């Protein structure tokens, strides 16, 4: 039916770097932005709420404001790519993309943060 995939399921990133984590979803021909819903969450923090073709930033957790955003132009390729700039120690944890595009599915990604 509708499956969401992740290239890797664990990312180890250095403190202060930028990271891009990816979720893939099925896209048949062009893209129905009306149909597309994306949610990124980690731990109990609201990262990204994208639904019915529109962004919502007021719901975003304050620690990610202006630091985290969803990379749109890959979506037409079936890629929900969350980029976080200037990774902090507190960005370590378990993330989860949730995609609705007709069907719905989600995957989990673990992030590990170093320090040097």
């Amino acid at each position: 039916a509708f499956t969401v995939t992740v290239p890797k399921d664990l990312y180890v990133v250095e403190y202060g770097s930028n990271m891009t984590i990816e979720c893939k979803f099925p896209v048949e021909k062009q893209l129905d932005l009306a149909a597309l819903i994306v949610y990124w969450e980690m731990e109990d923090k609201n990262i990204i709420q994208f639904v019915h073709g529109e962004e919502d930033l007021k719901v975003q957790h304050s620690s990610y404001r202006q630091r985290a955003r969803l990379l749109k132009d890959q979506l037409s390729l079936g890629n929900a790519a969350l980029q976080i700039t200037d990774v902090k120690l507190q960005d370590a944890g378990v993330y989860r993309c949730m995609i609705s595009y007709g069907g719905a599915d989600y995957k989990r990604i673990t992030v590990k943060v170093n320090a040097p």
Binding site: E41, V59, H61, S100
Partner: peptide
């Protein structure tokens, strides 16, 4: 499912802000 996710995203927004 997107309903449930928007239910939870809105619930936390109430808590945070």
């Amino acid at each position: 499912d997107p309903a449930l996710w928007q239910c939870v995203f809105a619930a936390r927004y109430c808590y945070e802000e």
